[PDB]
Amino acid sequence: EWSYTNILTGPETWHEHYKNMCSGYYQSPIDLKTDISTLDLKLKTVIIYRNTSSTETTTIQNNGHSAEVKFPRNTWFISFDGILDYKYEIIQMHFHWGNTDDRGSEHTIDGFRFPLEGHIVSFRRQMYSSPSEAIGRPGGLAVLGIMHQIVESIKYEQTAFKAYNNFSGVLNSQFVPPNNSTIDDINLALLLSLLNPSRYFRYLGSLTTPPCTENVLWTVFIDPVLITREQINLFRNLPYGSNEKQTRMGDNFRPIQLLNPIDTLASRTLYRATARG
Ligand SMILES: *[C@@H]1O[C@H](CO)[C@@H](O[C@@H]2O[C@H](CO)[C@@H](O)[C@H](O)[C@H]2NC(C)=O)[C@H](O)[C@H]1NC(C)=O
Ligand SMILES: NS(=O)(=O)c1ccc(NC(=S)Nc2ccc(F)cc2)cc1
Ligand SMILES: *[C@@H]1O[C@H](CO)[C@@H](O)[C@H](O)[C@H]1NC(C)=O
Numbered sequence: 692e693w694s695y696t697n698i699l700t701g702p703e704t705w706h707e708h709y710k711n712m713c714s715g716y717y718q719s720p721i722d723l724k725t726d727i728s729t730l731d732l733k734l735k736t737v738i739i740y741r742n743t744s745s746t747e748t749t750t751i752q753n754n755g756h757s758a759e760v761k762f763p764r765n766t767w768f769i770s771f772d773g774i775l776d777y778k779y780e781i782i783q784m785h786f787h788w789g790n791t792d793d794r795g796s797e798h799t800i801d802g803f804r805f806p807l808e809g810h811i812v813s814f815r816r817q818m819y820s821s822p823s824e825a826i827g828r829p830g831g832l833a834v835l836g837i838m839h840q841i842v843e844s845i846k847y848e849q850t851a852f853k854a855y856n857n858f859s860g861v862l863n864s865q866f867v868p869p870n871n872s873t874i875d876d877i878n879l880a881l882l883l884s885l886l887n888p889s890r891y892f893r894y895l896g897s898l899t900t901p902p903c904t905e906n907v908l909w910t911v912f913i914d915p916v917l918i919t920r921e922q923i924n925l926f927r928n929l930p931y932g933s934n935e936k937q938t939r940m941g942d943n944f945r946p947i948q949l950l951n952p953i954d955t956l957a958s959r960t961l962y963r964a965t966a967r968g
């Protein structure tokens with residue numbers, strides 16, 4: 692078992708409890724350094740798109756470590772090449788946040804932490820026929836990281852919670868693990884339009900929870916979407932699972948890893964994208 696807040700099973704111990712692959716040298720998250728990174732003009736605008744034929748329901752679960760939206764199969768997709776041919780299929784979205792407004796994200800941008808980081812998880816359908824085939828195999832996954840920032844003055848309609856449909860009001864103190872509820876579908880395309888989908892960091896890394904598999908193509912958008920203090924506080928109402936020391940869910944982020952730990956056998960590079968200027 693693992694946790695974020697119990698020192699016996701917490702992030703500092705993952706490298707020993709889950710050597711495959713939390714002891715690896717292509718771990719995530721990392722500090723996304725604007726100065727150090729390599730601008731690669733070939734990396735294209737990200738597109739998220741829906742299959743309009745899909746009618747299946749979306750659900751959300753308190754899994755004890757995060758709030759996790761589970762999307763139905765064959766519904767939401769990512770394109771990184773401008774073609775809408777289902778190369779990447781979205782599986783779930785979950786969130787990492789802080790006890791306080793000045794931390795919570797897993798990635799940092801030039802050392803800066805955001806209050807909330809969302810992770811849209813997809814599998815390389817182009818190669819693998821199902822999520823469960825992809826999740827443990829090389830090159831199986833692509834995750835999008837969406838930073839959120841708190842503003843004081845904003846209409847609900849322009850916040851990320853409009854795309855999320857407030858998660859159908861499920862984020863509250865009675866949403867205890869491992870409860871799951873049906874929720875309204877999440878408009879992921881609207882969510883993406885709240886930021887610049889051409890402006891992002893790109894690197895090869897890992898899942899950020901055990902077993903930290905090193906099979907994730909990461910894309911982290913630089914511009915945040917916007918939320919309110921009221922909205923962040925809804926997440927903080929969720930209870931942690933019983934293996935955590937802290938009662939309410941918060942600080943559910945993994946500490947920063949190095950792009951290239953000293954023991955690396957082949958260095959990786961951090962890339963950056965921007966719009967055809
Ligand atoms: C999601 O939550 C909001 C806020 O509770 C809902 O309704 C209103 O929208 C304004 C716009 O800025 C909010 O600030 C207000 O709190 C609400 N005002 C009133 C009097 O309705 C919104 O409808 C919810 N969305 C759904 C579809 O559940
Ligand atoms: N925090 S993260 O790095 O974004 C991250 C992303 C994804 C996961 N695990 C998943 S999707 N597991 C799973 C996938 C398919 C299945 F059939 C069963 C389980 C963990 C962390
Ligand atoms: C879209 O949804 C329909 C109906 O659920 C499904 O049969 C079809 O295969 C889906 N298309 C994909 C996954 O590209």
Ligand SMILES: [Zn+2]
Pocket residue numbers: 785786787810899
């Ligand atoms: Zn995550």
